[PDB]
Structure formats: C-alpha cells, structure tokens
C-alpha cells in the first residue's frame, strides 16, 4: 500500500491499522492525521491508552508500539503530523513541522527548524528544541510542560478564550497570568484552585482577549497582551511590549525597551536602569496615552500621532522641569539629573505634540 501526494498541500487521514503503509507527500506542505479514525475495539483492548510513536526524522510512524512492530507507516516529505486521541510520542525532523498531539497525554519534540507544537487536550510534554518554535495552548485546566529549547520561542494562549462555552475557569477576571521569570503560567483560575503550566526557555508570550498579566524574565522578551486591559512587565533585558486593544499598562523595567500601547488609553513606562545606557521607545499609538518618567530613567523618546490629549507624568516637581528644543524634538529634562524625556518631532506639527504634564 503506497500513497504519493501531489505538488500542493495534501492531507492524509491515516488509521491505526496493523498493515505497513508507504506515504510520500511530495512537494508542498503535507500533513498526516491520526485523530480522525476511530481506534478499533481490539486495539483499545490490547493497546490501552498508548497511541502512536512517530519520528519524522526516522521516517516511521509506529501505530501499534511494542505489540506489533510490523504496523509502521513509512513517511517522507511530510512536514506536519497530527496524533491520535491517545498518548502519543511524536518527534519532528530538522524542517519546520506542525506537530499536534490532540487528546491524550503526548510527548512532542520538534527537533530543528521553526516548529509549531500544539499539545491539545491532555497532560502534554512539549520540547521545541533548536529553532524559533511556537507553542499553541488550549482551553483546559490540565497542566502542560513546555521547554522552548534554544532559539526565540513563543507560547500562545489565544485559544484560552473562544466563542462558545469556555471549560477552564477565569474567575479572577484574567485570561492568563504568565511569569517567565518564575517559569510558570497560570492558565486558569477559580475560587481556591489554580492551574499552571511549566514554561521554560520560552522568550515570548501571546495573551488572550481578556485581561492578562504578562511578566518577562532577564532575556529579551516579546509580550503581546492582545485584547482586554493588560498588565505587562518586561523585566531585565531589551524587551518588546505590545498592549494591543484595550487600556493597557506596559512597563519595560531595566534595559532598552520598546513599548507599543496600541489602540486604547494606555500607560507606558520605559523604566530605569538597574546598573546611562537606558533608552526606551514609547509609542502609545492611538488614544489618550500616559507616559511615565522619573529620576534614573535615562533618555526615553515618545512617538505620538493624532494630536490628542496625551499626558506625561513625571515624578518630579514642576519647578524641577526644564524644556529645550532639540532639532524638531521637545526635550524635557529634570534639573540636577542627566535624565531627559524626548517627544519626537514635537515641533514639526501638532499631531506629534504632547501638551499635558502631571508633576509631583
């Protein structure tokens, strides 16, 4: 039994039968799926919860691990694999793989390349390994164990909040509460019980459409709050902070950070150096945005547009403030300090201007 795919994107629905099959996806991005076929009654009796043992690098999918070593799907030029509703052991190749575990407690390792791992429902152990890998998480209270490996990796919690009924609770008003500095993510919360993922070596977090708390670690992080009024703290390192829609609060902390308030009325604070080399970029975007500045913050630059009622809050008395034009920029210095807040192109036109300052 042989199957050769075309030059386009092909999808092969593979059963858990006992025969040996040859699969060649050919050109294009091709997927084998093992979650559409209903596992037979004899296999459920003799295999139990054990699913498939798949190795794209070895080019074999074992459909009856241990019990029937003949029952092997030999694959080549297949980039993506979807597991069974049972406990699977899935390993990609050095190419970009999409590896879905679906139901059951699956162990998935992507090997090299930029892989997309989705454990699905169940107690999943996910290794991104080399490359820039993405972990797609799902609406569930069961814990997952994520290791990004080397490279710039991303855990994505968009699917926590979806249309229809949501299984996992979110009774504190938050979608997820992610702390890369402590290596866990609170994916769900109820009165008197919390549900955590173990996340290690992952640099980036994508939030939900509800309020999220995203806290980075010492590395360069990219945190995207998405919808809802989010709270984002980058920690040390040069971070990239995205508020998205809603009224967000973005804190770059130490390092040279870049803050994108996005739509809505956002509060942007570049932070202060932990120890001169502290330059933060604050782009509040559209809406009425508030920029925080103080002693020890260094040299931060605001980029504004739309010419609204954006405000600046400086932790210093009004008589400590010193305004100077620099080219086309307005430069607000705190007397006695080397700290300076620059509004980019303030003198070019009204759209770039910020004209309200709250002082201490």
């Amino acid at each position, epitope marked *: 039994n042989t199957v050769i795919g075309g030059a386009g994107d092909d999808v092969f629905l593979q059963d858990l039968g006992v025969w040996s099959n040859q699969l060649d996806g050919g050109a294009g991005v091709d997927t084998v799926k093992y979650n559409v076929h209903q596992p037979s009654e004899e296999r459920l*009796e*003799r295999m*139990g919860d054990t699913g498939i043992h798949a190795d794209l690098q070895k080019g*074999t999918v074992e459909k009856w691990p*241990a*019990l*029937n*070593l003949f029952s*092997v799907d030999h694959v080549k030029n297949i980039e993506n694999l979807h597991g069974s509703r049972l406990n699977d052991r899935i390993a990609g190749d050095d190419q970009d793989n999409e590896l879905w575990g679906h139901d059951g407690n699956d162990t998935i390792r992507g090997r090299g390349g930029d892989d997309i791992l989705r454990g699905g429902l169940g107690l999943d152990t996910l290794y991104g390994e080399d490359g820039n890998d993405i972990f797609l998480q799902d609406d569930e209270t069961v814990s997952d164990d994520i290791d990004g490996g080397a490279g710039l990796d991303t855990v994505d919690y968009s699917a926590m909040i979806h249309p229809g009924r949501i299984v996992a609770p979110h009774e504190y008003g938050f979608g997820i509460e992610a702390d890369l500095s402590r290596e866990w993510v609170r994916k769900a919360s109820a009165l008197g019980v919390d549900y955590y993922d173990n996340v290690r070596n992952v640099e980036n977090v994508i939030g939900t459409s509800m309020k999220d708390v995203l806290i980075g670690d010492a590395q360069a992080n990219t945190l995207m709050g998405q919808g809802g009024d989010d709270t984002v703290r980058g920690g040390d390192g040069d971070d990239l902070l995205f508020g998205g829609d809603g009224n967000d609060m973005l804190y770059g902390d130490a390092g040279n950070d870049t803050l994108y308030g996005g739509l809505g009325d956002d509060t942007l604070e570049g932070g202060a150096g932990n120890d001169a080399r502290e330059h933060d970029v604050l782009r509040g975007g559209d809406g009425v945005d508030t920029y925080l500045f103080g002693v020890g913050y260094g040299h931060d630059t605001i980029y504004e547009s739309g010419g609204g009622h954006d405000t600046i809050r400086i932790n210093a008395g009004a008589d400590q403030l010193w305004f100077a034009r620099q080219g086309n920029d307005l430069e607000i210095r705190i007397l006695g300090t080397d700290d300076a807040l620059t509004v980019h192109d303030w003198y070019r036109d009204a759209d770039h201007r910020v004209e309200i300052i709250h002082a201490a």
Partner: antibody
C-alpha cells in the same frame, strides 16, 4: 524452518557478548524474532522483540540497557548484546520466531532455537 | 498479564486424567493464549496455541479450554512421554508474560 543459535559462551564478569540467531527456510523479513532468558532451573523471561525488516525493537523494561537487538537482512541473522554482565545474567538465551506479517496473527512462538548457553564467572 | 499456573507440581499415574490451570491478572483473549512444553536439555516447543488448538505433532489426548482470566490444559490419558514442564503464555498485551510453569511428573 529452523533458527541456528551461537555456541556456549564463557566470559569474564565485566565484559559483554554477542549471540547470533541465523534464520532459514522462510521469508526472513516477514516474521518477528523474540528473545527469552532462562536461568538454570527457572522459568521463562521475555527479553525483547525485533522486526528484522526495519530494525524496529521493543524491550522488557528490566532488560533496557542490558540487551540490544540487531538484524542483518543480508545474512538472515539476528544478534543480541549483553552489557555489564553479572552472575544474574548467567542463563540460557533462546530466540524464537514470532508474529507473522499476514492476515492470521496469533503472537505465538512456533519455532525455537536450541539456545545459547551464557555462563559468566570470575 | 500476570500469569499464575496451578499446581507447581502435578503427579499423575499412567492413564490418569490430567488438568493444569493458568490464570491471568486481567482478561486476555483466547486467540493470544498459548502453551509450551519443555523437557530438560531441550528448547520449549509450542504445544497448544490460541487456547484450544494443538501444534504440529501434539497427540490428540491433549486439549485446552478457557476464556477471560481462566484457562486450562488437559491430558485425557497420562503417558510417560508427557512428563515435562508446561508454560502458559499471553500476548494479549505487551510485554508478553509467561507462567511460572507446571512440572508434570509420573505418580508411582
């Protein structure tokens, strides 16, 4: 249909050893080869199984790291490594023909080799 | 899954009817329950496969029955050539497991 095994092996405690199991009389890559351990005056203990077509293997958990199976399709022969030998490894080791790649499958060991005596001692 | 055979030693005079049992810790299918015979100095031989089918050369006085967790091997008329150890074997689930064995001896 017969399975020819290696001869008796007397080796030092700390060493390793390979035993062979050469097949004949049937389609070699269409039958699984299984290995069984029998200590003197004791029952039967399953070691592991190998698919001679692909080299696929599965082991008893208590023999993982101790036993290692390989197959040579050209010579129609199956091998087994014993690593870190111990007095508790002195036993007779059988190779048996197992599952057939076909429509009638029952997982019985129909043809057994004579057994390779392995006795390890200082 | 865990095979228990009874008895450890079975003594039978010539012509006597013999029955040994083999129980599993979990339900196994009749198709994947087999019996083996072993005499000293020789390899085990497939004797009864799939609960009730005789292997090649096995005399018709042998038989086997059972289902679920309870299986048995029966000799209708003890013969001297029958004295050996009999192992039951399940391959319903992996890993396969053997019984401890029943040593059938001649009663005198």
């Amino acid at each position: 249909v017969q399975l020819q095994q290696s001869g008796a092996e007397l080796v030092r405690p700390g060493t390793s050893v390979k035993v062979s199991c050469k097949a004949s009389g049937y389609a070699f890559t269409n039958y699984l080869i299984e290995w069984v351990k029998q200590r003197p005056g004791q029952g039967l203990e399953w070691i592991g199984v190998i698919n001679p077509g692909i080299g696929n293997t599965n082991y008893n958990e208590k023999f993982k790291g101790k036993a290692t199976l390989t197959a040579d399709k050209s010579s129609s022969t199956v091998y087994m490594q014993l690593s870190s030998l111990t007095s508790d490894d002195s036993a007779v080791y059988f190779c048996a023909r197992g599952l057939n790649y076909g429509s009638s499958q029952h997982w019985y060991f129909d043809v057994w080799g004579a057994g390779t005596s392995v006795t390890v001692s200082s | 899954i865990v095979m228990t055979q009874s008895p450890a030693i079975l003594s039978a005079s010539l012509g006597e009817r013999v029955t040994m049992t083999c129980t599993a810790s979990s339900s196994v299918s009749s198709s994947y329950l087999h019996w083996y015979q072993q005499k000293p100095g020789s390899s085990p031989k497939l004797w009864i496969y799939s609960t009730s089918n005789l292997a090649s050369g096995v005399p018709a006085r042998f038989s086997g029955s059972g289902s679920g967790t309870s299986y048995s091997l029966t000799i209708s008329s003890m013969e001297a050539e029958d004295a050996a150890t009999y192992y039951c074997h399940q391959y319903h689930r992996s890993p396969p497991t053997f019984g401890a064995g029943t040593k059938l001896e001649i009663k005198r």
